[PDB]
Structures are given as C-alpha cells and as structure tokens.
C-alpha cells in the first residue's frame, strides 16, 4: 500500500460469498484484495523488526599488537617465566629455542623461551540474539479510493503483528472496516540466527556459523578476549629473539562469507529485509462509500492521461471543477457507441466530495482494442486503449 | 661456517687419493668437509639475495570511495549519462531503476540509471619480477683453527656466485687454498615466481597465481587502476537512489592465501628464505700449518670444559699461557695408561702462537667411556667422556 507503484504486485478476487480471503505477505511485494460490490484493499508488508536485542558474543577481525616481551632461559637454567605471562590481555607461548655457544650459553641444547605481547582488538563484529517471538510485523493497509499519490502516505493504516497477537481491526472513515488476521513465519528465516553487526552494516547468520569462526571472541560483560591465538602468528625462535606479529584484517573474508545472507539495518530497532506472514482478510464489514451521490455532469479534465501500470491496468488521474458531492462514471467499452462496460474497475465507484478534487482511476481494461470513457454528455472523455 | 652453533649439520670425509667433494648447501644448514691431514672446512649458504627487481604489477587489497554521483533518467527520457562516467580514477555502473508515479516519473517503467564513484587505493600490494640469472649465492667458508666464537665473524670469507659464475677460490693466511665450483639451483623454488610485498612482509609467489587474483591491478607506470569492479559494490536501485559501497580489508584472505610460500625480506636488495646450491670443493691446495712447532709442554688449563655439541663431537677452550709458538697434543685414548688415540680430530692439529691465546678444539670421541687428554707430564688435561 500503495500498490502502484510497488513492482511486484498480486491480485485477489473475493467472492460473493466469501467472508475470508487469504494472502501471504512478502517484503518489497504488495497484494490488492478485491471484492464485488466493495472497495478494493491494498495490503503489504512494510518493515518485520527487532526492538533492544541482547548481545551475545563479540568478535575480533582486527587486532594490534604491542609491548612484544621475552623470555630467554639458557640450556639446563630451567623453564623460562616472563612477568606478563599469567595476566589477561596478553597473547603468550612456550617454546624451546636450540641455542649453544654460538648465542650466549654454555651448553648446546634445548633453551626454554616464551614471548608474550598486548592484545588489543582495533575491529570486532557484534552478535546480537534473535528471540523468534519478540518479532513484530508491520503492515501496510489501504484502501483504494481516488487519493492522489502525494496524499498516499497520508491514508496507510499500520498494524503490528507479534509471534503471536490475536485479529486485528483496521476502520476507514466512510467505508467500514477489515479484519487482520496474520500469522507471522519465522522458523526457515529466523531459526538458528543471531544478527551480526560490522560498523554501519548488519546481518541475519547462522548461530553455529558464528559460534565456529576462527576468531577471537568475547563475553559483552567481561572484557576477556577468549582464544586470542587465532589472530597472532609466533615466528620459530632464532636464539634469543621470538617475532610476534598480528594476522591480517579479516574484515573482506568476513564479508564473503556472508554473502547471500539477509540484511539487517538499523534506524535509531532492527529492521529485517526478509520474512513473510501469511494472512486472513475479513471483507464484508467493508462498505462503499457515495452510492448515493448525484452525477459529476459537468465537464472534467485529465490531469495525467490514462498510462498503463505494467500490472494490466491503467491508472489516469481526473479534476472535478463544479460537481458538489458527486460520482464519477468510468467504464471500458469496446464501442463508443455501446455502453456495455467490458473494464474491470479497480477503484470501485469513484467520487469527488470538492471542486477541483483530482481523484486517482483505476481500470482493468479486456484484452484488444476498446475506449475508457469517464463521464457523460459531450462533456465526456474518451480514450483509445490497445491491449495485446 | 662456523658449524658449531649450526644445528642441521653435516660431516664429509675426503678420501687419501680424492680432490673433489661434492655437497649440498641450503640456509639454516652447514656442512664440515674434512679430509686426512688436512684442516676441516666449513662450508654454509649464508643468503640467497636479489637486487634491484623490477616491478611487474601493483594490486589493491584497500579501497576507499568518494564523490559517490548518480544521474537518474525517467522512462522513455532516454539513456542516462553521468559527467563523471569516463574519468578514469571513476567506477561506474549502468543499471535501470523501476519507476512510476510513485517516484517522480509519469510513464511505468525501466528508467535508465548510472552510478559512480571516487576509486582510491588506501593500501595495495607490490609485484616484482623473478630474474632467475639475477639470484646471487652467497656462501660462507672458513677453516676450524682454534678460533674463538668472538673472532668467528672475523675468520669467514665471502663467495657470490650468479645463476652461472666459474670456479672461485678461497686463500687462508698458512693454509693454502680451497676451490667452489658451485652450480645454483633456481628450478622448482623460482619458476613462475613474483616478489609480491605488503608493507613490511614479503613473498615468493606463484606468477599464474598472482595474475589471476580477483582485485585491482596497476601497471607502475600509469596509475589507472584496472578492474576496479572487485573491489566496488553496487545495489540494485531503489528509485533514484543506488547505495555504493567499498568491499572489506582483503588482508586477511590475502595473508591466508599466502600461508606456505617461501618468505622474503629486506634490508636497505631482496633476501630469499629458501633454494639449494650443489657444490664440488677442491682440498688438494689445502695444507696444515705449524707441523714444525714445538709442543706446548708447560701447563694449560680449560677456560671452558668438554661439552656436548650435540652433533656428536664435543668442544673445549684450551688457554696456552707459556708455550711459544706450538702445537698442543690431544687425543681420546680409552686409558689413562694407553697413549693409543680413538678419537677423530675435527680441529687437526691444534695451535697457539702467542701466550694466553685460547685455542678451540672439536673432537670427535668413540662410543663408549674414554678419556680426552690434552698435553703431556703432570700438565696433561683429562676428562672423563661417557658417549651413549
């Protein structure tokens, strides 16, 4: 809602008897409900959301290092101890460097070394829970009347759907109203997932995707980098010297395993690009509105021509100047000598309720060549429309 | 040389009637040519080097983008075109957007759309060619006189040899002469080869491998930077908008794909970490010096004990503080009764030419319990040996 104007778009006939209708909504997709004798229901799903999610992990993809510091015991004086071993922040290893007379010691052997440096993560990732059941969907409902497009945004009901709400009302003032009844899908899209953030850009991944990187990760409370091993390299002893460097910036690798994966993009609130609710429509609560009006007799402009929609429709726009409360008479016929309408009329019974009231048609002409005729008189517009 | 203090170490005994000896030199390695009545020679590949390569490529691993610009065209208003398009420092795409009344355009359908944006490479990756008739063989030679540690570094000589020098030779002051008849082997560890460097690190890599790598590459003349696309993203388009963003760090992935090629480092000239040479040494115009001393006969004593090298042998530091010019008697016998020597003489015939010199000496002890004597009288030195 409004549908023109989303590309993806789905039609749905109601029956006459018919009290339900049912649709499944998809993001960047849009369905228009229609039912004889009642006005037409544009619904979409606009945004599916996630509201203060809780951090779970944290993960280092660049880190730097600093303060590198040695230890370097000779063969037989013992295992070697550096001071800056047993504390937290800092990567460490034990090793044996051969050493002899050649560098400093008396005996040719195993002499023991460690080398210890400052972990400090310059770049990390954070993984948020994703608690299925605090999904809420929004959805867009409006109904078809002739509103300009710049007014479009001023007629569009929403409704939130939780993993579970009950049926919701939408009322329109003149028209009745419709009853929701959505049941949200998050098993295939929002099962085994955390949502994982890199500076400006997010994602939905797979828990144990995340939870089997090879990367250093944390505990949002502590600020203890577990496994720091898997970003710093120990270079083989030389003698006396051990080279600690820091790993690459995994940031690109972490990019490419997640392509394909759905976005996730913040707004002051998680927005989710992705999921869909399959839905049910209560429909004869919906009434239309100025059955009663007299006849626009007056003459009437096209403010934009009837164009065609790509849908299979064609959208025109119309300018009522003297008609008070009054409707609007549009039919498709294939002679404009015949008044036997062949269109399928999209805005259901159009009205204009003020002067110079620009109201938006639309019709859902036949297959060939026919003529969309509004209004009667010489004061009637007539055009030509073919349909291959 | 000096192969004492060399872990991965070799021993190569002369035959009475030979002239050549042939060996095998790789880095972190050395070998001790010895041949009877004949000082042993030390023999190691110091460095294998390149200098001055000429760069073949650049290749950008981090992109930063700017002036992101975008022209947008309505449908059926013609082709778009962006001012910006045909610079060269520009990424550019060409898309069409779905347009309607819903976002500006009168007409639904494909408006034509371009989208550019600023490429500049933040960090990028050198390749440099491998000249294999470039590859200079550095080797160090040097005899096992009673030279202390401290003066090792003032005993050893030099050899360069090209992908195809001639046959060089080493003169020692009292010696004579040894002759390296060296070929290199530069087949399987440079082939397709590129020098590819990142900031301070380096590596010999694959030239097929390089070429084919998915990112940005330069010619070091002009700075266009081609196939920039690997490192640009671009969104399909919303309705006029399109998102350009710039892929991640690729230092990582490029780091990890690196894991196992030869490493290469500089200084101030391109050190290789790795390649072989095969050698044939010439000990024929090798001579012993000081035959015709007298012996050492007043008392001496150890500045430092027999110790294990670990190769088998066994070292000790002999002070002469009274002998003139003369020779100092060792042997490992397996009595202190029998003067009958088991042990095999690596430093042939020890020497001290001035007072309180402190001569080395590398021996050779039997499998088994022995005694090493060194001197004669109540002077003589013993040590009790143990060989396992």
């Known amino acids: 809602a ?17 009290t339900w209708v049912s649709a499944t909504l998809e993001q960047d997709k849009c369905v228009t409900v229609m039912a004889p004798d009642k006005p037409s229901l544009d619904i979409s799903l606009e945004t599916v959301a ?5 951090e ?3 993960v280092c993809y ?3 290092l600093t303060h590198v510091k040695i230890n370097d015991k000779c063969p037989s004086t013992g295992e070697a101890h550096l001071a800056e071993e047993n504390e937290g922040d800092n990567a460490c290893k034990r090793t044996y460097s051969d050493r002899g007379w050649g ?24 993984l948020f829970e994703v608690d299925q059941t605090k999904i809420q969907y929004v959805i867009r409902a409006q109904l078809h009347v002739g509103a300009k497009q710049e007014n479009w945004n001023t007629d569009i009901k929403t409704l939130k759907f939780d ?9 329109f003032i003149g028209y009745g109203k419709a009853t929701l009844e959505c049941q949200v899908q998050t098993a295939v899209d929002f099962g085994n997932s955390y949502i994982a953030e890199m500076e400006t850009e997010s994602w939905i991944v797979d828990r144990q995707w995340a939870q089997d990187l090879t990367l250093p990760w944390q505990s949002g409370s502590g600020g203890v980098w577990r496994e720091m091993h898997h970003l710093v390299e120990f270079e083989p002893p030389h003698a006396a010297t051990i080279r600690v460097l820091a790993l690459g910036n995994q940031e690109g690798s972490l990019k490419t395993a997640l392509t394909g994966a759905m976005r996730v993009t913040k707004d002051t609130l998680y927005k989710l690009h992705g999921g869909h609710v399959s839905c049910r429509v209560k429909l004869s609560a919906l009434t239309l509105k100025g059955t009663s009006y007299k006849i626009c007799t007056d003459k009437m402009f096209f403010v934009k021509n009837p164009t065609d929609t790509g849908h299979g429709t064609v959208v025109m726009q119309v300018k009522v100047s003297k008609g008070a409360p009054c409707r609007i008479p549009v039919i498709v016929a294939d002679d ?5 309408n062949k269109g399928i009329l999209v805005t259901v019974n159009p009205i204009a309720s003020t002067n110079d009231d620009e109201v938006l048609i639309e019709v859902n002409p036949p297959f060939g060549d026919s003529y969309i005729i509004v209004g009667r008189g010489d004061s009637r517009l007539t055009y030509q429309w073919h349909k291959e």
């Open 50 to 54: 996630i509201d203060r999610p809780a």
């Open 336 to 340: 404009l000598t015949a008044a036997i």
């Open 2 to 18: 409004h549908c023109i104007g989303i590309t993806d778009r789905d039609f749905i006939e109601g029956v006459h008897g018919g």
């Open 163 to 171: 993993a579970l709400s009950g049926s919701q009302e939408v009322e």
């Open 103 to 126: 560098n400093g010691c008396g005996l040719f052997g195993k002499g023991s070394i460690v080398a210890c440096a400052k972990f400090t993560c310059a770049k990390s990732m954070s």
């Open 56 to 58: 779970v992990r944290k």
């Open 62 to 64: 660049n880190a730097v």
